[PDB]
Ligand binder design. Structure first.
Ligand SMILES: Cc1cc2nc3c(=O)[nH]c(=O)nc-3n(C[C@H](O)[C@H](O)[C@H](O)COP(=O)(O)O)c2cc1C
Ligand SMILES: Cc1cc2nc3c(=O)[nH]c(=O)nc-3n(C[C@H](O)[C@H](O)[C@H](O)COP(=O)(O)O)c2cc1C
Lengths: 149, 151
């Protein structure tokens, strides 16, 4: 019970970035990008159109989530993986990418919808957390050893 | 250059929740909710529809960000604040709410779009981080004291 322009003004208001691609060959050529995508990646919507997103891995290919995504795109199944991507200015950021296949009610053929969340904050937090836990364990072990004497 | 049901399948695929409300009086009655909202809040979409979202603050109406939102609702300007909300089962979760106004081709229109992000995970980390940092400091002090009496 809502208007189309309302749906569009919703998609503009998204925090996480959103992309829509047609599986046209081995690549997934992008036919739409929302403004949040432009803001996160720094890439202009006109720059991205009719291409595959693999360019966000500017030199950091071979991350295993890529193979996971390959399998998910082959089987027509959704997926969610964390990658290291690179903006226009080369800024490295962590990207929780969630891909959903979309079939039509008249045909079990596909469109792919991608959603990118900048987990960079969260990831740095987790890494720091693990480092600090290691440190704590270290100090506690040495204190126990000394206490033994 | 894309289809309408395509936009609908897009908004359904969102991780963060999305709500659309018409500013009707003091309340902001919601006319639409996306599935991410149902999943995050646990409330049934049919229960929420012709009501206002203030029910998510099950008594925790003393959070100050609310006043900010009130002012933002008065002047028709966007806003974003973090609140502690409560699902149907009462489980407390942290909610980054982002509100954007939407006007008609006549500048005087009343639509509000809300976006809810579940920051709970991040928040717990920070809390654990602080707590954990405390623990480390404690141990580091005691290990010094013993060594101070060993040589
Ligand atoms: C809809 C969609 C969005 C994607 N978004 C990203 C992205 O933001 N960053 C990224 O590194 N890969 C993204 N990918 C993955 C690449 O397009 C590509 O599928 C992946 O790198 C594996 O393909 P390849 O082995 O040919 O490189 C996306 C894929 C799809 C289908
Ligand atoms: C679109 C929209 C979404 C909202 N979502 C939430 C929410 O998820 N949680 C919450 O505590 N308040 C939310 N609010 C705020 C309440 O609806 C209400 O405006 C706020 O509590 C202040 O109004 P009050 O002082 O009358 O309670 C939302 C408001 C709008 C307009």
């Amino acid at each position: 019970m809502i208007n189309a322009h309302l749906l569009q003004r919703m998609i503009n208001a998204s925090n996480d970035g959103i992309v829509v691609a047609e599986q046209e060959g081995e690549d997934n050529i992008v036919i739409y990008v929302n403004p949040a995508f432009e803001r996160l990646t720094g890439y202009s919507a006109d720059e991205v159109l009719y291409q595959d997103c693999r360019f966000l891995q500017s030199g950091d290919r071979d991350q295993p989530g890529l193979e996971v995504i390959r399998q998910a795109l082959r089987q027509g199944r959704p997926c969610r993986e964390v990658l290291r991507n690179y903006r226009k200015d080369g800024s490295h950021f962590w990207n929780e990418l969630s891909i959903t296949p979309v079939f039509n009610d008249s045909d079990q053929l596909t469109y792919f919808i991608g959603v990118q969340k900048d987990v960079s904050v969260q990831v740095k937090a987790q890494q720091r957390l693990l480092q600090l836990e290691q440190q704590l364990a270290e100090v506690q072990a040495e204190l126990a050893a000394l206490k033994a004497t």
